Amino acid sequence: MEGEHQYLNLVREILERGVKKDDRTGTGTLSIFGPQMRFSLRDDTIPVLTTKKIFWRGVVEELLWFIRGNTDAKELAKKKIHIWNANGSREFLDSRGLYDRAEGDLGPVYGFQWRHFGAEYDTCSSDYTGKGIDQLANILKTLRENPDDRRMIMTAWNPMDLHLMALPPCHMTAQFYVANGELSCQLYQRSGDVGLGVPFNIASYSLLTHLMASMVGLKPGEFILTLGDAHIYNTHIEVLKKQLCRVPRPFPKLRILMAPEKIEDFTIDMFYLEGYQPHSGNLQMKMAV
Amino acid sequence: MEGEHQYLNLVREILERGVKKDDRTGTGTLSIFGPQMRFSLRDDTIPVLTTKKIFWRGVVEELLWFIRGNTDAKELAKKKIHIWNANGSREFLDSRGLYDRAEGDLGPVYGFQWRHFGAEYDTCSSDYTGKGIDQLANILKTLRENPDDRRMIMTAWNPMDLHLMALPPCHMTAQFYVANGELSCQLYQRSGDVGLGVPFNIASYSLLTHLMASMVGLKPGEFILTLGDAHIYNTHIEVLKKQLCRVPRPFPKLRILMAPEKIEDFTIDMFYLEGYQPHSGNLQMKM
Ligand SMILES: CN(Cc1cnc2nc(N)nc(N)c2n1)c1ccc(C(=O)N[C@@H](CCC(=O)O)C(=O)O)cc1
Ligand SMILES: CN(Cc1cnc2nc(N)nc(N)c2n1)c1ccc(C(=O)N[C@@H](CCC(=O)O)C(=O)O)cc1
Ligand SMILES: O=c1ccn([C@H]2C[C@H](O)[C@@H](COP(=O)(O)O)O2)c(=O)[nH]1
Ligand SMILES: O=c1ccn([C@H]2C[C@H](O)[C@@H](COP(=O)(O)O)O2)c(=O)[nH]1
């Protein structure tokens, strides 16, 4: 009942006890409230699902993009990452009342808040160096100097910047914790697409915990995802029932070849997955409009 | 197990698996990270502990004080609630570099954030009417018009206001959710004194959920407390081991006589605890 079984058990529970709940978009969900998953990062483990192939290059390039404080979707499209193109399109910015916003300029989403909380937003190409509160740098410093501190919070939930964002954050608040020279991270995610998004999010914050651990001379401990509204979309049900038949294989290991002086200078070449052995191909379409 | 056993199990888990940890001040804790408790608010139930008498009048008056957006500790001292006196004292404010702050003025803590997020703070006696984002009012409106919304977040965690606060928030972020016309609340608490503060916090946010439910014509559902650093102070250990020998009695019920048009106009006279039968014993000292 550890590891990937955590995720599979969450899928069953939503399928068996979920509540029907039309939703934001034209399509329905089965939904529960408040479920939690815990993943061991010990022995270099990283919880990348084996019952479904995860787009690992996508996870890495998006996280490095967050860590840099970047908000331009075009930067991800250049590395053939398409996950933010929809929400940064002329149509979608216009539907959000952001008419004077250049295509691919998502506003002060995630990374911007991580590295520049409270800074005035101009455009995604502006220079934000030394502007706002650098929550991530502050946490890294606290992990070196005072690891027992109970206020190591990094949030993207800034009520004043929500109207400027293409989308309000999902993975909204992370807390860090140290015991026995092990770094743990809890993520509060207000809303989780359990089929498509959550497996991505688990890989994202697990990697972040690994990377942050290597920056401050600590071993990785646990990643804990706590969800608000965890839902499966009605379209994903039959696909997920198939995924549940698959026997999980051991989780891959993360190898880190080096850690740079500044966390924002990490590149995909500095680390890789060793032993990632996922199963066959199966799709899950995401719905909006 | 369900109910109060959620709390007693958490205490046991910290005593048996907790990590030793010298903390903020010259004392130790046993600590774990990320534990969760779920409490039913169905059939009018409110999870006020029966294995230890909870200072219910304190819970109610502090929450009504939060809901008003009040930050003056002296308003609570007038109702013989002393829980915020220490942190609003001359000495404590000075130790925090708040030399130009009048005794009892805690800064833009909790409620202020609930009702006035991002508003510029002056003093606790200033008029904040219509200033900053009223997160609580926005949530109440969303529960009437669009209960399926998944952004019903009320937060006290304002990175820019932390330096002006007497203390940074513990109970920092609540989310609300609706399913089968039942209102649920999840609380994220970054740090929890499991012995003294957590029982109080459980009563506080359970009451808020009951009150909010009656404002918008929904029934109460579940209250979920998710902790960051869940810790027992070494000084509380022996007392808590005794509390665990006590067989819990059924939780009391909350009776609400009426609901006013605006939630900040609730008064202690509008509701009461029916059937609260705690055990007699006591103890537990702060720090
Ligand atoms: C983390 N994330 C954000 C995300 C996830 N789920 C969502 N679900 C919904 N309903 N709505 C969203 N806006 C949403 N956003 C993701 C994750 C994966 C993909 C995705 O489309 N994955 C493709 C790869 C996309 C691509 O081709 O670049 C895949 O084949 O796995 C999109 C967004
Ligand atoms: C919820 N809360 C805030 C609280 C709780 N635990 C803390 N623990 C620590 N270490 N530090 C804090 N600032 C703290 N604050 C509480 C709860 C109860 C009492 C308390 O001691 N109760 C007494 C005093 C209340 C009074 O006399 O007015 C009682 O009579 O019930 C204090 C703070
Ligand atoms: O990293 C992300 C971003 C978005 N979503 C999904 C969760 C919801 O199903 C969907 C829509 O978000 P809201 O409706 O909650 O705004 O986005 C995720 O699961 N993960
Ligand atoms: O509602 C509250 C407020 C505070 N605390 C406790 C948690 C910690 O023991 C202490 C706050 O200290 P830090 O977590 O900020 O170090 O107060 C609670 O349990 N509940």
HEC string of B209-238 equals HHHHHHHHCCEEEEEEEEEEEEEEEHHHHH
Ligand 1 atom 5, closest CA:
A197
Angle between helix A4-17 and A198-215 (nearest 10): 150
Which one of A152, A173, A176, A209 would you mutate to disrupt binding with B, by most B Cβ within 10 Å of its Cβ? A173
Q: How far apart are CA B98 and CA B107, in angstroms?
A: 9
Tokens, residue A173 = 């608040």
Cβ–Cβ below 8 Å for A188 and B155: no
Tokens, residue B178 = 């609706």
Residue B236: give the domain boundaries. 1-287
Residues 6+ apart with CB under 8 A from A165: A106, A107, A108, A109
For the purposes of burial, counting CB atoms within 10 Å of the CB of B8, is it exposed (0-12), middle (13-18) or buried (19 or more)? buried
Other residues' Cβ atoms within 10 Å of the Cβ of residue A89: 15
Which H helix or E strand runs over A275?
none
Yes or no: say if B189 and B171 are a contact pair by the CB < 8 Å rule. yes
At B258, the amino acid letter reads M
Angle at B166 between CA B164 and CA B171, to 5 degrees: 100
Complete DSSP assignment for chain B: --TTHHHHHHHHHHHHHPEEEE-SSSSEEEEEES-EEEEE-GGGB----SSS---HHHHHHHHHHHHHT--BHHHHHHTT--TTTGGGSHHHHHHTT-TTS-TTB--S-THHHHHHBTPPP--TTS--TT-SB-HHHHHHHHHHH-TT-S--EEE---TTTGGGSSS--SEEEEEEEEETTEEEEEEEEEEEETTTHHHHHHHHHHHHHHHHHHHHT-EEEEEEEEEEEEEEEGGGHHHHHHHHTSPPPPP-EEEE----SSGGG--GGGEEEES----S-------
**Residue of B223, B202, B262, B215 lying closest to B56 (CA atoms):** B202
Angle between helix B5-17 and B237-244 (nearest 10): 140
Q: Which pairs with CB-CB distance under 8 Å and at least 24 residues apart come from A114-118?
A: A114/A66, A114/A67, A114/A69, A114/A154, A114/A156, A115/A67, A115/A68, A115/A69, A115/A264, A116/A69, A117/A155, A117/A158, A117/B159, A117/B160, A118/A158, A118/B159, A118/B160
In ligand 2, the atom with minimum distance to the C-alpha of B76 is 28
Cβ–Cβ below 8 Å for B150 and A229: yes
**Sequence-ordered strand ranges (E) for chain A:** 19-22, 28-33, 36-40, 153-155, 171-179, 182-193, 219-233, 253-256, 271-274
Yes or no: say if B192 and B170 are a contact pair by the CB < 8 Å rule. yes
Q: Which of helix, strand or coil describes residue A96? A: coil
**B45 strand-pairing partners:** B253
In ligand 1, the atom with minimum distance to the C-alpha of A58 is 28
At A42, the amino acid letter reads R
In ligand 2, the atom with minimum distance to the C-alpha of B284 is 21
Q: After which residues is chain B broken (C to N over 2.5 A)?
A: none
**Residue of B172, B162, B132, B137 lying closest to B152 (CA atoms):** B137
Q: How far apart are CA A158 and CA A115, in angstroms?
A: 13
Q: What's the A58 CA to ligand 1 centre distance in angstroms? A: 10
> What separation in angstroms does the CA of A1 have from each of A15, A145, B224?
18, 36, 22
Is-catalytic flag, A185?
A: no
Cβ–Cβ below 8 Å for B226 and A188: yes
Helices (H) and strands (E) in chain A, counts: 9, 9
Closest CB from B31, B172, B186 relative to A33? B186
Residues 6+ apart with CB under 8 A from B69: B111, B112, B114, B115, B116, B128, B264
**Residue of A162, A45, A47, A38 lying closest to A96 (CA atoms):** A162
Q: How far apart are CA A214 and CA A183, in angstroms?
A: 10
Q: How far apart are CA B72 and CA B62, in angstroms?
A: 11
- Residues of chain A contacting B160 with CB distance shorter than 8 Å: 117-118, 133
Q: Which of helix, strand or coil describes residue A132? A: coil
Min CA distance, A185 vs chain B (Å)?
9
B271-274 vs B253-256, strand pairing mode:
antiparallel
Q: How far apart are CA A140 and CA A176, in angstroms?
A: 10
A116 touches ligand 3 (CB under 6 Å): no
Q: How far apart are CA B264 and CA B255, in angstroms?
A: 18
A33 touches B at CB < 8 Å: yes
Counting every residue written for chain A, the total comes to 289
Task: State the DSSP code for A251.
Answer: P
Q: How far apart are CA B229 and CA B19, in angstroms?
A: 11
Residue A27 CA neighbour count, 13 Å, CB half: 14
- Which of A23, A95, A191 to mutate to test ligand 3, by most ligand atoms within 8 A of the CB atom? A191
Yes or no: say if B151 and A191 are a contact pair by the CB < 8 Å rule. yes
Other residues' Cβ atoms within 10 Å of the Cβ of residue B138: 16
For the purposes of burial, counting CB atoms within 10 Å of the CB of B170, is it exposed (0-12), middle (13-18) or buried (19 or more)? buried
Q: How far apart are CA A8 and CA B254, in angstroms?
A: 38
Question: How many folded domains does chain A comprise?
Answer: 1
**B227 strand-pairing partners:** B189
**Residue of B166, B96, B14, B24 lying closest to A147 (CA atoms):** B24
Q: How far apart are CA B149 and CA B183, in angstroms?
A: 12
Ligand 1 atom 22, closest CA:
A83
**Which experimental method was this entry solved with?**
X-ray
> What separation in angstroms does the CA of B146 have from each of A72, A113, A192, A265, B150?
31, 27, 19, 43, 10
Angle at A224 between CA B17 and CA B195, to 5 degrees: 45
Tokens, residue B118 = 């991002």
Angle between helix A56-68 and A198-215 (nearest 10): 60
Q: What's the B51 CA to ligand 3 centre distance in angstroms? A: 41
Q: How far apart are CA B228 and CA A152, in angstroms?
A: 10
Tokens, residue B76 = 């609570």
A219-233 vs A182-193, strand pairing mode:
parallel
Complete DSSP assignment for A182-224: EEEEEEEEEEEETTTTHHHHHHHHHHHHHHHHHHTT-EEEEEE
Q: How far apart are CA B71 and CA B73, in angstroms?
A: 6
Yes or no: say if B180 and B163 are a contact pair by the CB < 8 Å rule. no
In chain A, the residue whose alpha carbon lies closest to the alpha carbon of B167 is A151
Q: How far apart are CA A76 and CA A105, in angstroms?
A: 12
Q: What's the B197 CA to ligand 4 centre distance in angstroms? A: 7
The position carrying tokens 């308003």 is B75
The reply to whether B170 sits in an annotated binding site is yes
Residue B46 CA neighbour count, 13 Å, CB half: 28
**Where on the phi/psi map is residue B10: left (φ > 0), alpha (ψ -120 to 50), or beta?**
alpha
Angle at B20 between CA B17 and CA B24, to 5 degrees: 135
**Residue of B196, B207, B167 lying closest to B39 (CA atoms):** B207
The reply to whether A70 sits in an annotated binding site is no
Q: How far apart are CA A35 and CA A226, in angstroms?
A: 6
Tokens, residue A246 = 């698959």
Q: Which of helix, strand or coil describes residue A256? A: strand
Closest CB from B172, B180, B228 relative to A19? B180
Q: How far apart are CA A230 and CA A252, in angstroms?
A: 25
Min CA distance, B269 vs chain A (Å)?
32
For the purposes of burial, counting CB atoms within 10 Å of the CB of B143, is it exposed (0-12), middle (13-18) or buried (19 or more)? buried
Q: How far apart are CA A158 and CA B272, in angstroms?
A: 36
Residues 6+ apart with CB under 8 A from A184: A176, A177, A178, A209, A221, A222, A223, A224, B33, B34
Q: How far apart are CA A179 and CA A127, in angstroms?
A: 37
Angle at B278 between CA B272 and CA B284, to 5 degrees: 110
Phi, psi for A232 (deg, rounded to 5): -105, 135
Task: State the DSSP code for A61.
Answer: H
Yes or no: say if A226 and B188 are a contact pair by the CB < 8 Å rule. yes
- Which of A31, A193, A225 to mutate to test ligand 3, by most ligand atoms within 8 A of the CB atom? A193
Residue A216 CA neighbour count, 13 Å, CB half: 28
